[PDB]
Design an enzyme around this catalytic site. Structure first.
Site, PDB file in Angstrom:
ATOM      1  N   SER A 158       7.706   2.104   8.497  1.00  0.00           N
ATOM      2  CA  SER A 158       7.041   0.840   8.204  1.00  0.00           C
ATOM      3  C   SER A 158       6.671   0.728   6.729  1.00  0.00           C
ATOM      4  CB  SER A 158       5.766   0.710   9.043  1.00  0.00           C
ATOM      5  OG  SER A 158       4.855   1.765   8.759  1.00  0.00           O
ATOM      6  N   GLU A 159       6.679  -0.495   6.207  1.00  0.00           N
ATOM      7  CA  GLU A 159       6.047  -0.777   4.921  1.00  0.00           C
ATOM      8  C   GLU A 159       4.655  -1.351   5.186  1.00  0.00           C
ATOM      9  OE1 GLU A 159       9.141  -4.289   4.587  1.00  0.00           O
ATOM     10  OE2 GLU A 159       8.800  -2.791   6.168  1.00  0.00           O
ATOM     11  N   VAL A 160       3.666  -0.874   4.436  1.00  0.00           N
ATOM     12  CA  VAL A 160       2.269  -1.224   4.696  1.00  0.00           C
ATOM     13  C   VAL A 160       1.739  -2.159   3.606  1.00  0.00           C
ATOM     14  CG1 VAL A 160      -0.063  -0.332   5.145  1.00  0.00           C
ATOM     15  CG2 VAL A 160       1.919   0.967   5.905  1.00  0.00           C
TER      16      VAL A 160
ATOM     17  N   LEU B 204       0.809  -1.221   0.000  1.00  0.00           N
ATOM     18  CA  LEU B 204       0.000   0.000   0.000  1.00  0.00           C
ATOM     19  C   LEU B 204       0.843   1.273   0.000  1.00  0.00           C
ATOM     20  CD1 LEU B 204      -3.024  -0.789   2.367  1.00  0.00           C
ATOM     21  CD2 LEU B 204      -3.181  -0.216  -0.065  1.00  0.00           C
ATOM     22  N   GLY B 205       2.163   1.105   0.026  1.00  0.00           N
ATOM     23  CA  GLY B 205       3.082   2.237  -0.007  1.00  0.00           C
ATOM     24  C   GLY B 205       4.103   2.208   1.112  1.00  0.00           C
ATOM     25  N   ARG B 206       5.212   2.914   0.897  1.00  0.00           N
ATOM     26  CA  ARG B 206       6.263   3.047   1.904  1.00  0.00           C
ATOM     27  C   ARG B 206       5.891   4.122   2.921  1.00  0.00           C
ATOM     28  NH1 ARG B 206       8.572  -0.503  -1.474  1.00  0.00           N
ATOM     29  NH2 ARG B 206      10.862  -0.614  -1.548  1.00  0.00           N
ATOM     30  N   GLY B 207       6.152   3.835   4.189  1.00  0.00           N
ATOM     31  CA  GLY B 207       6.112   4.850   5.233  1.00  0.00           C
ATOM     32  C   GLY B 207       7.538   5.154   5.651  1.00  0.00           C
ATOM     33  N   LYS B 208       7.700   6.114   6.551  1.00  0.00           N
ATOM     34  CA  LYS B 208       9.024   6.430   7.079  1.00  0.00           C
ATOM     35  C   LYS B 208       9.564   5.307   7.970  1.00  0.00           C
ATOM     36  CE  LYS B 208       8.876  11.493   7.129  1.00  0.00           C
ATOM     37  NZ  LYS B 208       8.078  11.772   5.905  1.00  0.00           N
TER      38      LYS B 208
ATOM     39  N   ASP C 241      -0.331  14.024  16.864  1.00  0.00           N
ATOM     40  CA  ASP C 241       0.009  13.994  15.440  1.00  0.00           C
ATOM     41  C   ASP C 241      -1.238  14.059  14.570  1.00  0.00           C
ATOM     42  OD1 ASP C 241       1.970  14.052  13.433  1.00  0.00           O
ATOM     43  OD2 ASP C 241       1.994  11.876  13.205  1.00  0.00           O
TER      44      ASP C 241
END
EC number: 2.7.11.1
Length: 326
Positions: A48-50, A42-46, A153
């Site tokens: 985590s990978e989702v 679902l995309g890269r996070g800073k 946040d």
């Protein structure tokens, strides 16, 4: 620096057992890795990978967040916050917590929510849509504040919207904290455009009201169609652009009231600015989203004095939400 107290839910954790907020002594009960099958990224996070996934056990639609190596104290806090808040209105529910036996790396498994790109979403929101979803985010915030937890946040990235089903979830509790009256927190805790003045002037004894400033920023971006509203280039510049809208006079009163030692580096950049009328940010392309009650609600969220701000439940009372009660 003059001490400060939250006007609501001040003593939630004071009268709560140690096991509720002592996340550090919390023991994680793991699930099985092989219970889950990955389907799509679902995309890269800073951090985590989702992945889009399915629990092959009960055929439930899940989202798994495979964590990058980070200090375990931080993730234990997130987990305990997630657990304490489970079942709450518009709070993302942690379904399970699994580990990869070969690589040791942990991953969090959440309920699936079908999210629309918020960048293209706010572009089509109706007047009612802003009120409705705002009322939904409020639900999550009042709930979490009532449980003695600050999110820290609140921003559009951390709000999952499923428009077709008009369903909303507050996510990414990785920065969330337990509120203890009198405690001083570190102020390096939000995203720049959503940081409250209290963080920018380094006032440490803050509370749930921080979220309400952030929620204010979100409202300003939605009704005016200017996202983000305060587009600062750095933390110092962020205050300047706030001051350009709320005025330098009320900012200086704010430091005085709380006897805040303003960073010497603010001396040459703040200057003098007047409080602008909100109706100045109104034009013909956004006019349909703006009403007298919307501008009143916003003015009562975006204030220097964190104590002055509306609490989440006080905000739900506002005229602006009188239609979304059905």
């Amino acid at each position: 620096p003059v001490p400060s107290r939250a006007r609501v839910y001040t003593d939630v954790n004071t009268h709560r057992p140690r096991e509720y907020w002592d996340y550090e002594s919390h023991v994680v009960e793991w699930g099985n890795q092989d219970d889950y099958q990955l389907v799509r990224k679902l995309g890269r996070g800073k951090y985590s990978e989702v992945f889009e996934a399915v629990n092959i056990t009960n055929n439930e639609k899940v989202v798994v967040k495979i964590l990058k190596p980070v200090k375990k104290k931080k993730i234990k806090r997130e987990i305990k916050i997630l657990e304490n808040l489970r079942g709450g209105p518009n709070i993302i529910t942690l379904a399970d917590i699994v580990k990869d036996p070969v690589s040791r790396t942990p991953a969090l498994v959440f309920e699936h929510v079908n999210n629309t790109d918020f960048k293209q979403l706010y572009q089509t929101l109706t007047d009612y849509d802003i009120r409705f979803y705002m009322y939904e985010i409020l639900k999550a915030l009042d709930y979490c504040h009532s449980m003695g937890i600050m999110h820290r946040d609140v921003k559009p990235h951390n709000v999952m919207i499923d428009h077709e089903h008009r369903k909303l979830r507050l996510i990414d509790w990785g920065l969330a904290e337990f509120y203890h009256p009198g405690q001083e927190y570190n102020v390096r805790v939000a995203s720049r455009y959503f940081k409250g003045p209290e963080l920018l002037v380094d006032y440490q004894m803050y509370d749930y009201s921080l979220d309400m400033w952030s929620l204010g920023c979100m409202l300003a971006s939605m009704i005016f169609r200017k996202e983000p509203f305060f587009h600062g280039h750095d933390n110092y510049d962020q205050l300047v652009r706030i001051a350009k809208v709320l005025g330098t006079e009320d900012l200086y009163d704010y430091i005085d009231k709380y006897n805040i030692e303003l960073d010497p580096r603010f001396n040459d950049i703040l200057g003098r600015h007047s409080r602008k009328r909100w109706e100045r940010f109104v034009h013909s392309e956004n006019q349909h989203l703006v009403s007298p009650e919307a501008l009143d609600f916003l003015d009562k969220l975006l204030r220097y004095d964190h104590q002055s701000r509306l609490t989440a439940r006080e905000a739900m009372e506002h005229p602006y939400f009188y239609t979304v009660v059905k």
